[PDB]
């Protein structure tokens, strides 16, 4: 509830006979982007995306550039290797995705570390919660799991996920404490849109909230509506805040039967919204 996270996301996309793969890396503290690398950008450097990281010195940018450029060269090999494992041709575009990070509690103590890899939009291999073993998703990926077990990659990575990652997360949170400790609860409201003379869409809104996790439910007379609810995916406002809505189509005159329940870390009490007609 006062817990935080540091995550890096990598995507490598092979370009058949058109040069090197498109590589894009992003790091995040909670839901705030703070670094970026894009193999097609001008700088060819890891670049800052949050003011509180701008402060880091030229050796920090030098080391993050070298490590992220390397990560992409190891993703470029892996695309060729995984093409071999899944017996695919050299003609098609393929994708590797990687995500890794750690979480701390409100007092800065390690909670969790993770690393998850994917090939063409499906699970390939992931590190287990214990941080000392792997789970492969199929028999191709079990080959990777044997290399990494041989080289004891889990134990080097554990030292980062439960050590280095936690110390740098704790620093970024201290260095960025203006930006990062702010929780914004949702500004909620309800709108009403007749479909016809006899029905209308009720839409329950949640606006300007941070961080992105939220729940929106529709109850009719205290019973859930999970089947007739239209839910949209949570979305960025573009100012660092998030938005979502949910809708139910209801018979005209029955609006006051329906409730929209809103849950967010910021909110003291879960909000209950009702469309109340004239008095």
């Amino acid at each position: 509830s006062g817990s935080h996270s540091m995550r890096y996301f990598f995507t490598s996309v092979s370009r058949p006979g058109r040069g090197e793969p498109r590589f894009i890396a992003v790091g995040y503290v909670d839901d705030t982007q703070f670094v970026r690398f894009d193999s097609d950008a001008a700088s060819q450097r890891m670049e800052p995306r949050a003011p509180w990281i701008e402060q880091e010195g030229p050796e920090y940018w030098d080391q993050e550039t070298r490590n992220v450029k390397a990560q992409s060269q190891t993703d470029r090999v892996d695309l060729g290797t995984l093409r071999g494992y899944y017996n695919q041709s050299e003609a098609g575009s393929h994708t590797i995705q990687i995500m890794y990070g750690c979480d701390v509690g409100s007092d800065g103590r390690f909670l969790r570390g993770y690393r998850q890899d994917a090939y063409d939009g499906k699970d390939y291999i992931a590190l287990n919660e214990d941080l000392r073993s792997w789970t492969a998703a199929d028999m191709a990926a079990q080959i990777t799991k044997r290399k990494w077990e041989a080289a004891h990659e889990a134990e080097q990575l554990r030292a980062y996920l439960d050590g280095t990652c936690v110390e740098w997360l704790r620093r970024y949170l201290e260095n960025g404490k203006e930006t990062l400790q702010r929780t914004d609860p949702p500004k909620t409201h309800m709108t009403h849109h007749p479909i016809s003379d006899h029905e209308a869409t009720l839409r329950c809104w949640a606006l300007g909230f941070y961080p992105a996790e939220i729940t929106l439910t529709w109850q009719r007379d205290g019973e859930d509506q999970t089947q007739d609810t239209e839910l949209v995916e949570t979305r960025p406002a573009g100012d660092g805040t998030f938005q979502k809505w949910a809708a139910v189509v209801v018979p005209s005159g029955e609006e006051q039967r329906y409730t929209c329940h809103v849950q967010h870390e910021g909110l003291p009490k879960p909000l209950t919204l009702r469309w109340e007609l004239s008095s």
Binding site: Y8, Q71, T74, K147, E153, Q156
Partner: peptide
């Protein structure tokens, strides 16, 4: 900061 490389898959 980014994590140290893993060896090839």
């Amino acid at each position: 900061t980014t994590a140290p490389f893993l060896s090839g898959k």
